[PDB]
Write a protein that binds this ligand. Sequence first.
Ligand SMILES: [Mg+2]
Ligand SMILES: [Mg+2]
Ligand SMILES: [Mg+2]
Ligand SMILES: [Mg+2]
Ligand SMILES: [Mg+2]
Ligand SMILES: [Mg+2]
Ligand SMILES: [Mg+2]
Ligand SMILES: [Mg+2]
Ligand SMILES: [Mg+2]
Ligand SMILES: [Mg+2]
Ligand SMILES: [Mg+2]
Ligand SMILES: [Mg+2]
Ligand SMILES: [Mg+2]
Ligand SMILES: [Mg+2]
Ligand SMILES: [Mg+2]
Ligand SMILES: [Mg+2]
Ligand SMILES: [Mg+2]
Ligand SMILES: [Mg+2]
Ligand SMILES: [Mg+2]
Ligand SMILES: [Mg+2]
Ligand SMILES: [Mg+2]
Ligand SMILES: [Mg+2]
Ligand SMILES: [Mg+2]
Ligand SMILES: [Mg+2]
Ligand SMILES: [Mg+2]
Ligand SMILES: [Mg+2]
Ligand SMILES: [Mg+2]
Ligand SMILES: [Mg+2]
Ligand SMILES: [Mg+2]
Ligand SMILES: [Mg+2]
Ligand SMILES: [Mg+2]
Ligand SMILES: [Mg+2]
Ligand SMILES: [Mg+2]
Ligand SMILES: [Mg+2]
Ligand SMILES: [Mg+2]
Ligand SMILES: [Mg+2]
Ligand SMILES: [Mg+2]
Ligand SMILES: [Mg+2]
Ligand SMILES: [Mg+2]
Ligand SMILES: [Mg+2]
Ligand SMILES: [Mg+2]
Ligand SMILES: [Mg+2]
Ligand SMILES: [Mg+2]
Ligand SMILES: [Mg+2]
Ligand SMILES: [Mg+2]
Ligand SMILES: [Mg+2]
Ligand SMILES: [Mg+2]
Ligand SMILES: [Mg+2]
Ligand SMILES: [Mg+2]
Ligand SMILES: [Mg+2]
Ligand SMILES: [Mg+2]
Ligand SMILES: [Mg+2]
Ligand SMILES: [Mg+2]
Ligand SMILES: [Mg+2]
Ligand SMILES: [Mg+2]
Ligand SMILES: [Mg+2]
Ligand SMILES: [Mg+2]
Ligand SMILES: [Mg+2]
Ligand SMILES: [Mg+2]
Ligand SMILES: [Mg+2]
Ligand SMILES: [Mg+2]
Ligand SMILES: [Mg+2]
Ligand SMILES: [Mg+2]
Ligand SMILES: [Mg+2]
Ligand SMILES: [Mg+2]
Ligand SMILES: [Mg+2]
Ligand SMILES: [Mg+2]
Lengths: 57, 76, 190, 137
Amino acid sequence: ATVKVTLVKSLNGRLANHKACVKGLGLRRINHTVEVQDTPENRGMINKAYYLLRVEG
Amino acid sequence: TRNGRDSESKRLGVKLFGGQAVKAGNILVRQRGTKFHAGYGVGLGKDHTLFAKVDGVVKFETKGAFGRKYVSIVAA
Amino acid sequence: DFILNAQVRSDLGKGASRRLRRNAGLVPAVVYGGDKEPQSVTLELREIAKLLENEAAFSHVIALNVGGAKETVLIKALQRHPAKGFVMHADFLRVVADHKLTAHVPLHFINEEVAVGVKQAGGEISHTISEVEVSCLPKDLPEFIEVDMAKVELGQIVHLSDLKAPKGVELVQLAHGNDLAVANIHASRV
Amino acid sequence: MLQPKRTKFRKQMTGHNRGLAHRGSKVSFGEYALKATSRGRLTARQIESARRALTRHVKRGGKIWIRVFPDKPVTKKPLEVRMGKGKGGVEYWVAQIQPGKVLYEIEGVSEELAREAFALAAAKLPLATSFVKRTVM
RNA sequence: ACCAAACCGAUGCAAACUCCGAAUACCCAGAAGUGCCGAGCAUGGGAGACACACGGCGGGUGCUAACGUCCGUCGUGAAAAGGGAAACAACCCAGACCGCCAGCUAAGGUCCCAAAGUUGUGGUUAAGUGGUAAACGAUGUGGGAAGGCUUAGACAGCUA
RNA sequence: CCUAAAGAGUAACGGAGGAGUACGAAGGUGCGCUCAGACCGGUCGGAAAUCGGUCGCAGAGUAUAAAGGCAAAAGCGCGC
RNA sequence: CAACGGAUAAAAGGUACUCCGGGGAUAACAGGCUGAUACCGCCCAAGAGUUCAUAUCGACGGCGGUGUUUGGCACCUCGA
RNA sequence: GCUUGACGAUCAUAGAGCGUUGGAACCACCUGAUCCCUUCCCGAACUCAGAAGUGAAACGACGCAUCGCCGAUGGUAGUGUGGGGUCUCCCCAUGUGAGAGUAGGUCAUCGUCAAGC
Ligand SMILES: [Mg+2]
Ligand SMILES: [Mg+2]
Ligand SMILES: [Mg+2]
Ligand SMILES: [Mg+2]
Ligand SMILES: [Mg+2]
Ligand SMILES: [Mg+2]
Ligand SMILES: [Mg+2]
Ligand SMILES: [Mg+2]
Ligand SMILES: [Mg+2]
Ligand SMILES: [Mg+2]
Ligand SMILES: [Mg+2]
Ligand SMILES: [Mg+2]
Ligand SMILES: [Mg+2]
Ligand SMILES: [Mg+2]
Ligand SMILES: [Mg+2]
Ligand SMILES: [Mg+2]
Ligand SMILES: [Mg+2]
Ligand SMILES: [Mg+2]
Ligand SMILES: [Mg+2]
Ligand SMILES: [Mg+2]
Ligand SMILES: [Mg+2]
Ligand SMILES: [Mg+2]
Ligand SMILES: [Mg+2]
Ligand SMILES: [Mg+2]
Ligand SMILES: [Mg+2]
Ligand SMILES: [Mg+2]
Ligand SMILES: [Mg+2]
Ligand SMILES: [Mg+2]
Ligand SMILES: [Mg+2]
Ligand SMILES: [Mg+2]
Ligand SMILES: [Mg+2]
Ligand SMILES: [Mg+2]
Ligand SMILES: [Mg+2]
Ligand SMILES: [Mg+2]
Ligand SMILES: [Mg+2]
Ligand SMILES: [Mg+2]
Ligand SMILES: [Mg+2]
Ligand SMILES: [Mg+2]
Ligand SMILES: [Mg+2]
Ligand SMILES: [Mg+2]
Ligand SMILES: [Mg+2]
Ligand SMILES: [Mg+2]
Ligand SMILES: [Mg+2]
Ligand SMILES: [Mg+2]
Ligand SMILES: [Mg+2]
Ligand SMILES: [Mg+2]
Ligand SMILES: [Mg+2]
Ligand SMILES: [Mg+2]
Ligand SMILES: [Mg+2]
Ligand SMILES: [Mg+2]
Ligand SMILES: [Mg+2]
Ligand SMILES: [Mg+2]
Ligand SMILES: [Mg+2]
Ligand SMILES: [Mg+2]
Ligand SMILES: [Mg+2]
Ligand SMILES: [Mg+2]
Ligand SMILES: [Mg+2]
Ligand SMILES: [Mg+2]
Ligand SMILES: [Mg+2]
Ligand SMILES: [Mg+2]
Ligand SMILES: [Mg+2]
Ligand SMILES: [Mg+2]
Ligand SMILES: [Mg+2]
Ligand SMILES: [Mg+2]
Ligand SMILES: [Mg+2]
Ligand SMILES: [Mg+2]
Ligand SMILES: [Mg+2]
């Protein structure tokens, strides 16, 4: 019902779309973690920026 | 070289897409010839411009014989 | 002997099929026909290629053992890598006792050295097509249509209507009002 | 030297040469063929020079097909000429070649005699080639 | 006896061909959350700038030459230090408020220069290949699936 | 028109063509009709004029380049 | 007023006798990148060599090396 | 519930071709050009007045896949994002996914009204 998402790579040089996807979950800096609800709209921003984030589930 | 000429671009094409809200008098499609034909609530200009005579929603249906494409306005 | 072994294929798509050829050395395949739904199978590459150097590979009926079940099919189409030539995909057509099926049957030219147009007038043979499309019940499907060119004068044309088919076999193209030439005799090139 | 009798337009863009040859990759007419394995393009002086070497070896019966037609004009800008000031004049014609395309075919000869004949033609062409027979499918 | 419109079947090519036809991009509507407490728009005060560079992708031009030239779209430099690529604006990692003789990692690495495995298991190479290259040539060597002859005597030698 | 990357826009002393007009009817409206081409027969024309018949569906036409259109024909004729 | 957002109603040339303000934003020399061209190798072998492709040459085609000629570009230098 | 006629929905899975078939009513052909109207000539077409004939043609219905038209499954090409290579081109992970061809399908399916059966 709730997922743990952690940013593990830099946001420098990413596409403006992907910067907006990580910023839409609440992540700000590297090794930051946030507990977001498991909604289809949030799940779709994780998958758009999968290569930057670690999902603990 | 005996080639360097061209003409300014006319900005033709679909202006309002399907499902959009129209007001009367709005311009829908700019054309050369009739690539889209006028359906219900749609009039044709003297340069084959499709505009709106009523208010509603763009439809964009193909129907009838000859397999034409029609732009119409339906109730929102 | 015309036997093939295949296992049921569950993972489909481009990524899964490219893995079968690269890692496992297998080949994707289809089993449609009859009155049944199509079934996806996979089979070894070194076994399908071993069956394909028989002359009557596509003109003979095969007993495809899928898992533990068995059934009677015929090679309908075959995909090959354009450059390397190995087989990439094959689809089988099921065989039903009461149902017409079409096939590609090779042509055997016989007693060419006995041809009149060669010894007497010094002509040359030129096969134009080495296969035909037939349509017959599976009980009387021929391995090869034998074309005889012993009594062929120089400059003579051999059409589809000039050859003989076994009992209950149709030439398809002839039935559609188009009897295209099979072979000819012509003067030497220079 | 093959070239179209007439063309709609005099010149062409350089373009690109991608993909494989899923069309024109079978032995359609003859019984043995010379296939292409690498990509490139043949310049209609190589196609002629490889045809002369092939028919001269057999020189007794047989029939030979050419399956490639050079129909793409290419240009060259003359020497000691700056950049610009138009597009250069047409110099020669080429055929785009993709891996798997069949180049020449032959029949009416022995299976072995075909191999020495295609090896003489393959040495005049700027790409890797392969020898294939005809299959039912 | 050469040539043959036209038709039939097979068979290729097209930026200025199309019976077809995506992925993306784009326009609209409705929804949860995040936004540094804002993002959007409007009206006013003050500007600077209108010589761009390279790298990836899609192209024209050139020779699918140039650290060449001209467009579209991203990233970096310009205006960006730190670590790596020996040195090396534009490549990879990562964005410096200040101090610490504290710890964990990224790219890249762990024999000595020079911080860290002369770490463990199974193979390959003999070329200092690694540590610059093409058509083509060769009993270099490892692995694999099949063939042709063969105790009616096979292959090399040797005698007629 | 292409380049131009399936919304618009997009450069080069890049690849190809046109314009600097015409029409008082070649405009409006009501009514009516379908082309090019092939073949067969027919007085001189004869491969090709005018005529009759069959097939055809747009391969014709559009004042003028090319692109996009054209059966309620936007094509052709007549009255006002 | 076509130089087509049209400086005026009204307008061509020389300078090796020349002068000033600037530019390596832009040429000539030399350097750099490239290597079409040039030079040097190699592959296939129709043929010449009385017969014999490779003693010696080698058509039609193909693959490279070097920076060496004619070029292409305009990166350094016009407070030499 | 069936036949005929008129108007529509939908634009080939609905079309073309072949064969059979209907006239009691409807329809068409049909008779005639006095009258209304007509032909760049002509009752061919348009129009009018009709009732001897015929379903010949046209039209409707019912049959056949021969041509046409639809058309899977599977595979292939291409492709957004991230990463590689021997980098004029391709490969890997993930998402997406044709065109052509094959098995096969199709001789349509509906609504309102008026006359009959
Ligand atoms: Mg920035
Ligand atoms: Mg980056
Ligand atoms: Mg131009
Ligand atoms: Mg032009
Ligand atoms: Mg433009
Ligand atoms: Mg109007
Ligand atoms: Mg993939
Ligand atoms: Mg180009
Ligand atoms: Mg193609
Ligand atoms: Mg195109
Ligand atoms: Mg065109
Ligand atoms: Mg704040
Ligand atoms: Mg302001
Ligand atoms: Mg300026
Ligand atoms: Mg500028
Ligand atoms: Mg720029
Ligand atoms: Mg510039
Ligand atoms: Mg630049
Ligand atoms: Mg380019
Ligand atoms: Mg580019
Ligand atoms: Mg190019
Ligand atoms: Mg530059
Ligand atoms: Mg470049
Ligand atoms: Mg760029
Ligand atoms: Mg600056
Ligand atoms: Mg830096
Ligand atoms: Mg540094
Ligand atoms: Mg270095
Ligand atoms: Mg350093
Ligand atoms: Mg550590
Ligand atoms: Mg590491
Ligand atoms: Mg140490
Ligand atoms: Mg060790
Ligand atoms: Mg070394
Ligand atoms: Mg070395
Ligand atoms: Mg676009
Ligand atoms: Mg556009
Ligand atoms: Mg611009
Ligand atoms: Mg002009
Ligand atoms: Mg007109
Ligand atoms: Mg006539
Ligand atoms: Mg009409
Ligand atoms: Mg001026
Ligand atoms: Mg101006
Ligand atoms: Mg202007
Ligand atoms: Mg003066
Ligand atoms: Mg001077
Ligand atoms: Mg002077
Ligand atoms: Mg001065
Ligand atoms: Mg000065
Ligand atoms: Mg400079
Ligand atoms: Mg300038
Ligand atoms: Mg000097
Ligand atoms: Mg210089
Ligand atoms: Mg210097
Ligand atoms: Mg000689
Ligand atoms: Mg070099
Ligand atoms: Mg030098
Ligand atoms: Mg030089
Ligand atoms: Mg420059
Ligand atoms: Mg100077
Ligand atoms: Mg100085
Ligand atoms: Mg000095
Ligand atoms: Mg009448
Ligand atoms: Mg599919
Ligand atoms: Mg798909
Ligand atoms: Mg399909």
